[PDB]
Swiss-Prot record:
Tissue specificity field: Found in all tissues tested, particularly abundant in skeletal muscle.
Record-annotated FAD-binding FR-type domain positions: 42-289
Catalytic activity: 2 methylcob(III)alamin-[methionine synthase] + 2 S-adenosyl-L-homocysteine + NADP(+) + H(+) = 2 cob(II)alamin-[methionine synthase] + 2 S-adenosyl-L-methionine + NADPH; 2 cob(II)alamin + A + 2 H2O + 2 H(+) = 2 aquacob(III)alamin + AH2
Function: Key enzyme in methionine and folate homeostasis responsible for the reactivation of methionine synthase (MTR/MS) activity by catalyzing the reductive methylation of MTR-bound cob(II)alamin. Cobalamin (vitamin B12) forms a complex with MTR to serve as an intermediary in methyl transfer reactions that cycles between MTR-bound methylcob(III)alamin and MTR bound-cob(I)alamin forms, and occasional oxidative escape of the cob(I)alamin intermediate during the catalytic cycle leads to the inactive cob(II)alamin species.
More about this protein: It is debated whether the reduction of free aquacob(II)alamin occurs spontaneously or is enzyme catalyzed.
Listed GO CC annotations: cytosol; intermediate filament cytoskeleton; nucleoplasm
Protein name per the record: Methionine synthase reductase
Gene Ontology BP, a term: homocysteine metabolic process
E.C. designation(s): 1.16.1.8
Organism: Homo sapiens (Human)
Residues binding NADP(+): K61, S366, R367, Y374, V375, Q376, D409
């Protein structure tokens, strides 16, 4: 059976009218500046000691808990801290890209970089994220975000290395004024990366120097500390969903995130310890109050629960040291899709409640058939207690998780709560929350 495409079908490689017949306003070509020669020749490395799948096998998103052994380091952390993980690109992706650039057989050559004597770029400097003299393999694996969506100026540069007339034309369309919609749809929304484009435009043969002028730094990914060193001394836990998304890939439907895809591969045999390189974030503010008598409210749907597991572990240990202490209330608003699939830490939370560490637990299930569906609905149902904690009892509220929408939804809920509870106008309520934030009693750790 043949792949047969009808005349009306547009795609990354094919426009339809009007764009296909349009006069193009094409951006100016970026001035090349890099000269490449291929020469033949406070970071902590910590083992992964444990990994646990927290979700059922049929959960739409797979959530993992990973334990790192920090015992042979001088690394320290407090609950709510974040740290950065240094991750590589997929070996298969790096191989495919080097193969496509006809560079696979030079993968062990050292990349020596200079500025071209004859460049028309002012202020041209060597990219700081490409270590001078490292192997091509090393640079593609560890230094370059090969997943990055090519900008219009990168597409513009690739026009000049594309020999097929229709393919060159399509790339002109994709970087032009007139091709804005097609770029947004077929490149940006589609999450297309360089390899995807080069496979889609087989006649595009760009030089390595051009890639190194456009591919950005491969950034480390931060994770939140999901444990207390009081509770698991010498260990550090973190929790993450494996990211999976639809892309331009022709032979694969879902692509995994760079860091979470790698972590999942690393821990397969632990689920000869695998090791990863991490480093602390110098500033961290998402912390328990110094005064343990102060009541707190934690709002952490899905994996946003992560730092709060660390807060609760910390308080368990603090309480063990000092029974009879004046310890403030601890409220958790947790949300997930299905009680029977992704109710993270269900047993541990039960433990915290049983022992009087967690004062109140309010869990919402957004996809179970019927009741509060999201954390914001449950917060509203307990508005009186929430208002009193924040406004009469000097309390703090913490909101963590991947959605910025979640953060806005929680915010708007609190606005409604303060208006109704104190009986002030929506505007005074909004300014109260802003003053709460200014005083560091309303804290956010938002992940996207």
């Amino acid at each position: 059976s043949n792949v047969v495409i009808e005349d009306f079908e547009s795609s990354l490689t094919r426009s339809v009218p009007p764009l296909s017949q349009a006069s193009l306003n094409i951006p100016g070509l970026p001035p090349e500046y890099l000269q490449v020669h291929l020469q033949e020749s406070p970071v902590f490395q910590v083992p992964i000691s444990k990994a646990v799948q927290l979700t059922t096998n049929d959960a739409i998103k797979t959530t993992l808990l990973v334990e790192l052994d920090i015992s042979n380091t001088d690394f320290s952390y407090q609950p709510g801290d974040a740290f950065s993980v240094i991750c590589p690109n997929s070996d298969s992706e790096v191989q495919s890209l080097l193969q496509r650039l006809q560079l696979e057989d030079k993968r062990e050559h050292c990349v020596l970089l200079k500025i071209k004597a004859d460049t028309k770029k002012k202020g041209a400097t060597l990219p700081q994220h490409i270590p001078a003299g490292c192997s091509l393999q090393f640079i593609f694996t560890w230094c370059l975000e090969i997943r990055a969506i090519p900008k219009k100026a990168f597409l513009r540069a690739l026009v000049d290395y594309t020999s097929d007339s229709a393919e060159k034309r399509r790339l002109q369309e994709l970087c032009s004024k007139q091709g804005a919609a097609d770029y947004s749809r077929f490149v940006r929304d589609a999450c297309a990366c360089l390899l995807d484009l080069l496979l889609a435009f087989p006649s595009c043969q760009p030089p390595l120097s051009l890639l190194l002028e456009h591919l950005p730094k491969l950034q480390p990914r931060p994770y939140s500390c999901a444990s207390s060193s009081l509770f698991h001394p010498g260990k550090l836990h973190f929790v993450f969903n494996i990211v999976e998304f639809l892309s331009t890939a022709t032979t694969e439907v879902l692509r995994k995130g760079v860091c979470t895809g790698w972590l999942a591969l690393l821990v397969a045999s632990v689920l000869l310890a695998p090791k990863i390189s991490i480093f602390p974030r110098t500033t961290n503010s998402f912390h328990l109050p110094d005064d343990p008598s102060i009541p707190i409210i934690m709002v952490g749907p899905g994996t946003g629960i992560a730092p709060f597991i660390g807060f609760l572990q910390h308080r368990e240990k603090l309480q063990e040291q000092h029974p009879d202490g004046n310890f403030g209330a601890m409220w958790l608003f947790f949300g997930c899709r299905h009680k029977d699939r992704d109710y993270l830490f269900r047993k541990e939370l039960r433990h915290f409640l049983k022992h009087g560490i967690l004062t109140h637990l309010k869990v919402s299930f957004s996809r179970d058939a019927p009741p509060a569906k999201y954390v914001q609905d449950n917060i509203q149902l307990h508005g009186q207690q929430v208002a009193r904690i924040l406004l009469q009892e000097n309390g703090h509220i913490y909101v963590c998780g991947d959605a910025k929408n979640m953060a806005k939804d929680v915010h708007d809920a609190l606005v409604q709560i303060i208006s109704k509870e104190v009986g002030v106008e929506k505007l005074e309520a909004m300014k109260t929350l802003a003053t709460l934030k200014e005083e560091k009693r309303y804290l956010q750790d938002i992940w996207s």
